[PDB]
Amino acid sequence: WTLKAGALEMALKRVYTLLSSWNCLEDFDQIFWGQKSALAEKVRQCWQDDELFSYQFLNGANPMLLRRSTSLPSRLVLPSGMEELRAQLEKELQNGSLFEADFILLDGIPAEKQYLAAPLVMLKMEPNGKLQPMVIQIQPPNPSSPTPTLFLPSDPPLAWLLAKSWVRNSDFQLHEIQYHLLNTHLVAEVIAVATMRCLPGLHPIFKFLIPHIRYGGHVQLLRRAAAQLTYCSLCPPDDLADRGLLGLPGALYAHDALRLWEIIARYVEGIVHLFYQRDDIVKGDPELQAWCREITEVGLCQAQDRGFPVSFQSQSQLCHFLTMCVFTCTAQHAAINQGQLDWYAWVPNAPCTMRMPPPTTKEDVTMATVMGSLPDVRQACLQMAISWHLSDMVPLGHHKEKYFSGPKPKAVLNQFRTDLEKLEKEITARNEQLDWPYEYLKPSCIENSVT
Ligand SMILES: [Fe+3]
């Protein structure tokens, strides 16, 4: 249950075992014959469009990587005689308009033989709202490349596509290992056990948390991910702030996540201020304090060097942490998981595996090269299988149970529902006006727990 060695290696096996059970004709019709999503069908036809490539960094299956650059990455070595790329990256950084998708956590991992790369994409945002790519670097510098080729939108079309496609494969990897398995599922397992371990069932925050938690490499990558898991990464206000995605009107994941955070927060602090009336109570609850330590020190593996608390000194310190717990188990899993059907069905747009190494030049890139690198029918079709299965339930805030008895808690949970209905009708109204709606965080679509 920990994030050790170790435990993480056992996690991946249990995941393969689950996925294996869908390697059969279980929903074959549905699947490979039935109607695919409206968005899936949109992706199929626009996937080569540079804007659709870019757009996904904001509102696709994985909107957790993109960042607004403050300086140009040290890995982005620009060869002599690209004064123009130089000047344009400079222009954008000075304008506060330069963004990046840096896939470095993959650097150095090897991957039935699959090839990995650790690319960097630099994108500009124009007043429009729209993100346009400027340059892809597929491998980082290292000490016999010196100056990795820089692939550009103006290059031989099939080279630009191969470059982009490697970026999507890399996005596929980080998305599933880091942002889905680790950050939602495995962090959920830590929260869950630690609740079971340190808090008796009638402990108020056990009652609060419970409706949300019943119950090679890869290995390399998952270990590194778990290594750099910070507390702020799991908190939208912090996270969207640390990545410069605040004040971005077309950042719909960002908007929705943040608007949910405020709902969860208000619901959280409402319940907390009832039981822990004042900071003194929080500080003095020894069980809660064990529960905190159990998550940060044991479960997350000495995670107190990555923003995580070792104690709760106050209501605010506890509400912030309790809001992170709900969000991780509910909203964020919704955001990370609900998009596989839409974005990963059309396999060329999110290739699960690449079967050749990345190109070192932009020269001699052929359909043979492209088709050779992209997955095969078997890999690609099993991809589609799993993504459909992944993407009856109890929605967020609707645990048809009453662990709390008073009218005071009931009022709190009642406002939560009202605010959730408020966001619901807001999201659905916005989405109606858009060709590319975002709906992985509509409150009704979020399950009251990771399952
Ligand atoms: Fe999941």
Please name the residue that has the structure tokens 């500080």. Answer: 283
Please answer whether residues 151 and 70 qualify as being in contact, where contact means their C-beta atoms are separated by less than 8 angstroms: no
Of 41, 67, 50, residue with least CA distance to 164? 50
Please name the residue that has the structure tokens 């000194």. Answer: 313
Span from the CA of 182 to the centroid of ligand 1 (angstroms): 10
Alpha-carbon distance 266 to 422, whole Å? 14
Backbone angles phi, psi at 175, to 5 degrees: -55, -45
Span from the CA of 12 to the centroid of ligand 1 (angstroms): 13
Determine how β-strand 67-68 pairs with β-strand 98-102. antiparallel
Span from the CA of 214 to the centroid of ligand 1 (angstroms): 14
* CA 161 distance to own-chain centroid: 24
Structure tokens given for 119: 């690319």
C-alpha dihedral over 411, 203, 319, 272, to 10 degrees?
Answer: 40
In the chain, ranges of CATH 1.20.245.10 domains: 1-71+152-451
333 is in an annotated binding site: yes
Alpha-carbon distance 195 to 271, whole Å? 17
Span from the CA of 359 to the centroid of ligand 1 (angstroms): 33
Span from the CA of 329 to the centroid of ligand 1 (angstroms): 10
399 is in an annotated binding site: no
Structure tokens given for 239: 């996270």
203 is in an annotated binding site: no
> After which residues are there C–N gaps above 2.5 Å in the chain?
111, 215, 391
Structure tokens given for 342: 């839409």
Q: In what order do the strands lie in the sheet with 67-68?
A: 67-68, 98-102, 120-125, 131-137
Task: Tell me the HSE value of 70 on the side-chain side, using a 13 A CA sphere.
Answer: 4
Three-state SS string over 132-160 comes to EEEEEECCCCECCECCCCCECCCCCHHHH
Span from the CA of 183 to the centroid of ligand 1 (angstroms): 10
CATH architecture classification, 1-71+152-451: Up-down Bundle (1.20)
Span from the CA of 185 to the centroid of ligand 1 (angstroms): 6
Span from the CA of 177 to the centroid of ligand 1 (angstroms): 11
Please answer whether residues 248 and 254 qualify as being in contact, where contact means their C-beta atoms are separated by less than 8 angstroms: yes
128 is in an annotated binding site: no
Structure tokens given for 202: 């009638």
Please answer whether residues 254 and 154 qualify as being in contact, where contact means their C-beta atoms are separated by less than 8 angstroms: no
Span from the CA of 389 to the centroid of ligand 1 (angstroms): 10
Please answer whether residues 178 and 62 qualify as being in contact, where contact means their C-beta atoms are separated by less than 8 angstroms: no
Span from the CA of 181 to the centroid of ligand 1 (angstroms): 7
Span from the CA of 368 to the centroid of ligand 1 (angstroms): 35
Alpha-carbon distance 201 to 195, whole Å? 9
Tell me, which fold does domain 72-151 have in CATH?
Answer: Nuclear Transport Factor 2; Chain: A, (3.10.450)
Q: What type of residue sits at position 1?
A: W
Three-state SS string over the chain comes to CCCCCCHHHHHHHHHHHHHHCCCCCCCHHHHHCCCCCHHHHHHHHHCCCHHHHHHHHHHCCCCCCCEECCCCCCCCCCCCCCHHHHHHHHHHHHCCCEEEEECHHHCCCCCCCCCCCCCEEEEEECCCCCEEEEEEECCCCECCECCCCCECCCCCHHHHHHHHHHHHHHHHHHHHHHHHHHHHHHHHHHHHHHHHHHCCCCCHHHHHHHHHCCCCCCHHHHHHHHHCCCCCCCCHHHHHHHCCCCCCCCCHHHHHHHHHHHHHHHHHHHHHHHHCCCHHHHHHCHHHHHHHHHHHHHHCCCHHHCCCCCCCCCHHHHHHHHHHHHHHHCHHHHHHHCCHHHHHCCHHHCCCCCCCCCCCCCCCCCHHHHHHHCCCHHHHHHHHHHHHHHCCCCECCCCCCCCCCCHHHHHHHHHHHHHHHHHHHHHHHHHHCCCCCCCCCCHHHCECCCC
In the chain, ranges of CATH 3.10.450.60 domains: 72-151
Span from the CA of 89 to the centroid of ligand 1 (angstroms): 37
Please name the method used to determine this structure. Answer: X-ray
Span from the CA of 333 to the centroid of ligand 1 (angstroms): 6
Q: Which residues contact 94 (CB under 8 A, 6 or more apart)?
A: none
Resolution in A: 2.6
Alpha-carbon distance 413 to 407, whole Å? 10
Span from the CA of 124 to the centroid of ligand 1 (angstroms): 31
Alpha-carbon distance 189 to 425, whole Å? 32
Span from the CA of 194 to the centroid of ligand 1 (angstroms): 20
Please name the residue that has the structure tokens 């992170």. Answer: 324
